[PDB]
Amino acid sequence: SMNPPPPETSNPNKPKRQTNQLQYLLRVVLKTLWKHQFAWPFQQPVDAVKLNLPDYYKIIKTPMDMGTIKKRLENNYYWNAQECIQDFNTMFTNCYIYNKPGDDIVLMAEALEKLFLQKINELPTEE
Numbered sequence: 676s677m678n679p680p681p682p683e684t685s686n687p688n689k690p691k692r693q694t695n696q697l698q699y700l701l702r703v704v705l706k707t708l709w710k711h712q713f714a715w716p717f718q719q720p721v722d723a724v725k726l727n728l729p730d731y732y733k734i735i736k737t738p739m740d741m742g743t744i745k746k747r748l749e750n751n752y753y754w755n756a757q758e759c760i761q762d763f764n765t766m767f768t769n770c771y772i773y774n775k776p777g778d779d780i781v782l783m784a785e786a787l788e789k790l791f792l793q794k795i796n797e798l799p800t801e802e
């Protein structure tokens with residue numbers, strides 16, 4: 676079983692803008708999680724081929740990861756902050772669907788998610 680193509684990170688047909696909320700999402704929220712001890716399972720799409728996980732994309736139909744989110748922000752793929760927040764939520768949801776209580780990755784996801792929520796609770800004012 677092959678990996679699916681990774682999520683689109685650029686769309687030359689979508690209008691683009693910079694906002695303070697998107698600045699905060701890339702340079703505060705994403706950066707805080709990206710530099711964290713537990714970031715590494717979440718920095719790129721799950722490679723079901725190299726890791727020999729042929730059921731991963733049978734179970735996870737909306738994959739998402741912080742490498743994709745980072746590239747989406749850097750390519751101005753998001754217009755609304757909620758599009759980016761939704762991607763982080765999807766990434767965490769996938770981890771809790773595929774993995775079980777007691778798995779190390781679940782503990783890593785919980786710690787990253789706590790930090791994500793703390794940072795998003797300080798999202799700046801909308802324009």
Ligand SMILES: COc1ccc(S(=O)(=O)N2CCCCCC2)cc1NC(=O)c1[nH]c(C)c2c1CCCCC2=O
Binds near residue numbers: 715722769
């Ligand atoms: C044993 O699992 C790994 C071992 C090493 C690395 S790695 O060293 O980072 N690396 C180099 C080797 C080839 C893959 C590309 C990066 C990653 C992973 N695995 C993840 O990054 C990852 N993430 C999630 C969200 C998952 C998983 C897989 C396990 C649990 C299921 C899951 O939900």
